[PDB]
Amino acid sequence: TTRRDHARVVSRSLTGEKFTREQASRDPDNYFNIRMLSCPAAEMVDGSEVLYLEQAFWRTPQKPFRQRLYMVKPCPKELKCDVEVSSYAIRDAEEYKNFCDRPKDQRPLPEEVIGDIGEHLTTIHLNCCDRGKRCLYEGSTSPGGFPNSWNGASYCTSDLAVLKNNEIHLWDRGFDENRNQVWGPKEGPYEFKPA
Template identity: 85%
Template sequence: MNNNAGNLQVVDLWYDWPNGRNFNIIQNQLGKLLYDLEWDNGTSYIYTLDSNQECRTLRFPVGVLRPNWLEGANYLGQQQVDGFLCNVWEKVDFIWYYEDVKTKRPVYWAFYTGMVAHVMTFEVGAVLEDKNWQAPVYCLRRVWRRGVLYLNLWLVVDLLGGYKVLEMGTGSESNGWSRARGLVVKTLVMIGSAILVKRLTKSTTRWDHARIVAQLLSGEKFSREQASRDPDNYFNIRMVTCPAAEMVDGSKVLYFEQAFWRTPQKPFRQRFYMVKPCPKELKCDVEVSSYVIRDAEEYKNFCDRPRDQRPLPEEVIGVWGVKEGPYEFKPAPASSINDMFSPLNSPPPQLMEKRIEGSFVLQE
């Protein structure tokens, strides 16, 4: 039983380490039944089995939780929880784990986000049939649909090309007409197929757009050209962005870092970017939110490190920022404009004579 700020979930968790798989069957309070199938190769499928046939494919490079995950945790002593006397461990300020002193079974989990999990039953050796570990076919549908389309397109074109050759061989008198007719038919089919391809490829979802934006943001970039053109006003800054994690809802979390190009090991700006589709009520496709990092020193040069030396993906959630949306800044009423500035920081009078009307949104 999970409780996250009053939102309840009943979760059946099947952990099968020998076969490298983990399965969460999640019933949200007054919500849909969700299946979260995780494999040790880093692939996860989150789907429903209802008529909507929803499915998302996620990538978690670390794979399934290891049996020895508690190594290196801090032992905090014993505490009474849910009617059990428990040993308590804390790990990386991320999770507090409680296990029964007598049986060593898990009793309670507490996450730094405030979410808690009460373990109602725990059965060692319980087995879920293999047929239930298979993601539904519609999880793969979008992967092969476009490939089949292009394959069919080229087969049609090749068949028409063969038809043209046969027509050309029927006689010298009709040779020119046959060639023209074959070219016309072939051209019409290719134009029609191209239109069909264009329409289908346009039917991407906002999640596809979010993925593309995340890919475009990722990588190493420099302001070298700008600094060369105007060295008095611009520095050569190195900006590097790389994937840090993928949230359960499919949002991409990117680590962002800026440093002077001569000293990349000393970043002066570190952020997490969360890339996801905009809410339906907003007129946009993709929302990019910026978050301050709780422990900037720990994440320094994150993208330049080997993957096994980076903080674990679940620690990436350790950020803080706005919860309900960006801050909105608008011009102050004329009656209060003089109250906004003290004599020490007031701009010159000539700058205040003509106010600039406008507003902007600051996400960070």
């Protein structure tokens, strides 16, 4: 299987409707039941697949608290990873609310989506997991960047694992200028499983 094949598995695994209900029943102290809803929104010139993804508390599924655009593409031959997943904020997120439940003519078109891509938030390079590992793919935001790159302000980290049967483990955390955690779960990733 090629890196293009791997990227297609990752993008497929990220699409659909998912809940963290099982994890919330197992550890209610630390995790809520969150609904994730995602579907493809555009395709870039370089073959990159662009997914819209939103998260909502299960009791208010039409009021998402997070809205993102994710780009999934095979890692280039020079890099040693398999799949790159990068996330972006949206220019005017209200236009994208419940995107995946609206007809194509009443929601942003793929051309509009390309120009609605906002600030880059995360890049994760995923590797295919070894045989016998629980995951299919796993990766984290890079621990290092170019010299003189950090602007000294709040930053975020992300860990992503893709498991069998379209299960996604996602840990998004934000930190302040002194490396105190300011948002996101403290204990570990949210475990999203299909509805």
